[PDB]
Enzyme design. Structure first.
Site, PDB file in Angstrom:
ATOM      1  N   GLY A  28       3.522   0.890 -38.168  1.00 58.14           N
ATOM      2  CA  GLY A  28       2.235   0.981 -37.492  1.00 58.14           C
ATOM      3  C   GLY A  28       1.324   2.128 -37.895  1.00 58.14           C
ATOM      4  CB  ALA A  29      -7.448   5.910 -34.877  1.00 54.96           C
ATOM      5  N   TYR A  30      -4.422   7.577 -34.379  1.00 54.49           N
ATOM      6  CA  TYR A  30      -3.805   8.851 -34.032  1.00 54.49           C
ATOM      7  C   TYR A  30      -2.729   9.281 -35.021  1.00 54.49           C
ATOM      8  N   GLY A  31      -2.291   8.385 -35.892  1.00 57.74           N
ATOM      9  CA  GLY A  31      -1.258   8.695 -36.860  1.00 57.74           C
ATOM     10  C   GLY A  31      -0.612   7.426 -37.373  1.00 57.74           C
ATOM     11  CB  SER A  32       1.174   6.614 -40.359  1.00 54.76           C
ATOM     12  OG  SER A  32      -0.090   6.995 -40.877  1.00 54.76           O
ATOM     13  CE  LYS A  48       2.584  10.135 -32.300  1.00 53.93           C
ATOM     14  NZ  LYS A  48       2.285   9.726 -30.890  1.00 53.93           N
ATOM     15  CG  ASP A 163       1.824   4.613 -25.879  1.00 52.13           C
ATOM     16  OD1 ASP A 163       2.574   5.392 -26.507  1.00 52.13           O
ATOM     17  OD2 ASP A 163       1.385   3.549 -26.368  1.00 52.13           O
TER      18      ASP A 163
END
Ligand SMILES: Cc1ccc(N2C(=O)C=CC2=O)cc1C#N
Ligand SMILES: [Cl-]
Ligand SMILES: [Cl-]
Ligand SMILES: [Cl-]
Ligand SMILES: [Cl-]
Ligand SMILES: [Mg+2]
Length: 346
Positions: A28, A29-32, A48, A163
């Site tokens: 898988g 805009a906050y990171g990869s 992450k 989350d």
């Protein structure tokens, strides 16, 4: 002390991680995010890599906020932090942050996709959400974003909250979108300063959907959703109207024809009467009057699972940083200190 790291490029990104993490595979805009096998613990994990963690004051503070929250959470029904690392050897070369958690499979959406569950399953799932929420709220933390895609569930019906809301844009909340269907009206419409009671509204929306198999308030926009809400719970009286800060919002509410609270037994046809009673106590328009998580755990609907000696509270949590004004490099130094002081769980 410092492990050996190894580098590799995977799907346009350079990943530099300790040797313990093997067989990385993107997921898988906050990171990869990559899935990996952790050879030290035997767990399948999610790793992450944060994207641009210190690009602005707002982004640097958000990175610090996320790490502080994840380091605190130690409860069976809440996601915890397995590891945090940086390849940097000093503060001067510190740029990248990686977070490691247990790899989660199915969420509550999958268990409930167009489908309703048996009453014993509803009892156990909602019990676990409330057990985790008692813990979160005891530390004066508000989740803000509870919804089925933020609840992990395994084959044994065991549940974890994930989350946390780190403070979603206007576009993400526009239209026929699940990102808004579970939000309390006072936050959806900016009526007043909100508190932890917003999370109890979300639990009521989730519980209703498990009982019926359908979204409770699937509004096509903010106003359509408000109309669906007020048809079920009734229009407000003067007592709640006085608590709404915006005169415009008060004027809008009073433009609507008055409606009484509906009979919940005639909405949730065939549900356990104790489930109907609990829903009436969660889905209250005035947040001051909603049941709390601690009160809900003692409700008779959960009699077969409630154990007041096995429903723990959290250690105290220091949020004074939220009102502090610092420069980018100061937030970055605070984050570095939290990375290097991390102690793994047993
Ligand atoms: C509209 C509706 C009302 C009630 C329910 N329902 C059950 O079937 C069992 C507990 C409950 O609330 C489902 C639907 C659906 N679909
Ligand atoms: Cl290692
Ligand atoms: Cl966990
Ligand atoms: Cl780095
Ligand atoms: Cl969702
Ligand atoms: Mg999510």
């Amino acid at each position: 002390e410092r492990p050996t790291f190894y580098r590799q490029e995977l799907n346009k990104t350079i990943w530099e991680v300790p040797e313990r993490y093997q067989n990385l595979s993107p997921v898988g805009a906050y990171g990869s995010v990559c899935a990996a096998f952790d050879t030290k613990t035997g767990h399948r994990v999610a790793v992450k890599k944060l994207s641009r963690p210190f690009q602005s004051i707002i982004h640097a503070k958000r990175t610090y906020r996320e790490l502080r929250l994840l380091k605190h959470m130690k409860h069976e029904n809440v996601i915890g932090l397995l590891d945090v690392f940086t390849p940097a050897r000093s503060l001067e070369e510190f740029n990248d942050v990686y977070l490691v958690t247990h790899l989660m499979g199915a969420d509550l959406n999958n268990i409930v996709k167009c489908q309703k569950l048996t009453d014993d399953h509803v009892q156990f799932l909602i019990y676990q959400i409330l057990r985790g929420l008692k813990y979160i709220h005891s530390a004066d933390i508000i989740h803000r974003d509870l919804k089925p895609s933020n609840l992990a569930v395994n084959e044994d019906c065991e549940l974890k909250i994930l989350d946390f809301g780190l403070a979603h844009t206007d576009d993400e909340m526009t239209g026929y979108v699940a990102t808004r269907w579970y939000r309390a009206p006072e936050i959806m419409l900016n009526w007043m300063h909100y508190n932890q009671t917003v999370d109890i509204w979300s639990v009521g929306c989730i519980m209703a959907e498990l009982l019926t198999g359908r979204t409770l308030f699937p509004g096509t926009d903010h106003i359509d959703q408000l109309k669906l809400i007020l048809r079920l719970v009734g229009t407000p009286g003067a007592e709640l109207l006085k608590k709404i800060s915006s005169e415009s919002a008060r004027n809008y509410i009073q433009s609507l024809a008055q409606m009484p609270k509906m009979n919940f037994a005639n909405v949730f046809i065939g549900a356990n009467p104790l489930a109907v009673d609990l829903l009436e106590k969660m889905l209250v328009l005035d947040s001051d009057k909603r049941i709390t998580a601690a009160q809900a755990l003692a409700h008779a609907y959960f009699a077969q699972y409630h154990d007041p000696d096995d429903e723990p509270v959290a250690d105290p949590y220091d949020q004074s940083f939220e009102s502090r004004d610092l420069l980018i490099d100061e937030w970055k130094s605070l984050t570095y200190d939290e990375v290097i002081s991390f102690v793994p769980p047993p």
